Amino acid sequence: GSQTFYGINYGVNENSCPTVDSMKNDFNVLKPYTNRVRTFALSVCNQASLALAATQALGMRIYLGMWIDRPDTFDNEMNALKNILANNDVSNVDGLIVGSEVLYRGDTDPQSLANYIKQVKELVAPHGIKVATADVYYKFPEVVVKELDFLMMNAFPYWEGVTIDNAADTLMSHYDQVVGASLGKPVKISATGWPSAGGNFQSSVASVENENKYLHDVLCRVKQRNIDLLYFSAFDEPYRGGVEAHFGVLGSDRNTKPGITIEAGC
Numbered sequence: 001g002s003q004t005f006y007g008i009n010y011g012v013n014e015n016s017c018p019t020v021d022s023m024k025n026d027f028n029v030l031k032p033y034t035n036r037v038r039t040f041a042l043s044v045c046n047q048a049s050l051a052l053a054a055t056q057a058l059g060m061r062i063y064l065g066m067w068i069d070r071p072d073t074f075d076n077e078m079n080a081l082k083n084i085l086a087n088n089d090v091s092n093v094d095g096l097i098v099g100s101e102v103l104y105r106g107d108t109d110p111q112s113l114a115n116y117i118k119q120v121k122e123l124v125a126p127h128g129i130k131v132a133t134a135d136v137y138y139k140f141p142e143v144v145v146k147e148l149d150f151l152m153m154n155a156f157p158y159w160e161g162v163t164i165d166n167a168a169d170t171l172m173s174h175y176d177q178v179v180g181a182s183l184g185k186p187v188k189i190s191a192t193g194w195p196s197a198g199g200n201f202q203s204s205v206a207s208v209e210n211e212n213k214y215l216h217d218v219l220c221r222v223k224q225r226n227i228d229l230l231y232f233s234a235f236d237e238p239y240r241g242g243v244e245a246h247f248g249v250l251g252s253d254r255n256t257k258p259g260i261t262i263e264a265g266c
């Protein structure tokens with residue numbers, strides 16, 4: 001069952017940073033279901049350095065994310081990347097995700113993002129690390145795609161008001177659109193998930209039964225087409241509030257969630 005998830009997204013509380021041992025304990029709980037995790041920032045809580053130590057001690061692999069929005073974050077994250085290359089083994093890194101939903105938010109223009117990606121690639125390619133960026137299905141302009149090794153899609157049919165019966169079918173449809181913008185490069189999925197509590201979004205209903213269904217459907221669909229998927233997310237995160245506090249496969253105290261069965265639908 002350590003093949004059930006290709007990988008899993010792992011959240012971090014910036015106002016209450018973990019330790020190496022605390023990360024090791026967290027990743028340990030996940031080991032029966034996966035061998036791979038993903039972090040969202042390099043410098044924040046020094047999380048990238050600590051997660052490399054934790055994954056390596058446990059024999060696991062990792063995707064490393066760079067968090068860029070405000071102008072200063074471009075300098076800070078690049079300096080953190082340089083420190084990582086000098087202070088860490090990186091042989092267990094499957095990719096570097098340069099920004100997440102940068103174009104969706106309008107943090108910067110397409111040409112500027114392409115230039116930053118180009119600089120990142122020049123630094124890590126001799127270390128043997130492939131580069132991507134993550135964004136919504138309608139935000140992959142050619143000028144950005146030209147600089148990538150591969151593409152990663154964030155897509156949540158829940159935030160689209162899509163009903164649970166149609167949700168995984170819609171995910172796959174959005175995937176086909178990213179392929180259309182891919183220039184023939186490989187396409188992966190960096191994030192999708194479904195909340196267990198916190199109300200509804202139009203016809204999209206939040207419940208334990210629905211998260212269970214969505215998990216089964218997506219795992220089946222990506223297996224049929226040989227698509228690599230990072231599920232969102234590992235544990236519930238209360239400090240986000242409301243619906244955003246209920247995306248975990250497991251609970252906030254690292255116990256299992258009653259009603260969730262971890263398995264693929266085919």
Ligand SMILES: OC[C@H]1O[C@@H](O[C@@H]2[C@@H](O)[C@H](O)O[C@H](CO)[C@H]2O)[C@H](O)[C@@H](O)[C@@H]1O
Pocket residue numbers: 010011012014040041044067233237
């Ligand atoms: O802590 C770094 C940045 O994290 C951002 O939230 C992330 C979300 O975009 C993503 O979808 O989920 C992960 C894990 O739950 C979050 O870390 C914040 O929005 C940023 O303000 C923050 O700098």
Ligand SMILES: OC[C@H]1O[C@@H](O[C@@H]2[C@@H](O)[C@H](O)O[C@H](CO)[C@H]2O)[C@H](O)[C@@H](O)[C@@H]1O
Pocket residue numbers: 101136154155156157159160
């Ligand atoms: O609350 C805003 C959230 O919006 C999400 O983007 C949505 C996509 O996931 C979804 O597939 O499409 C719709 C537009 O058709 C987007 O709004 C982000 O993924 C979240 O990070 C964000 O919090």
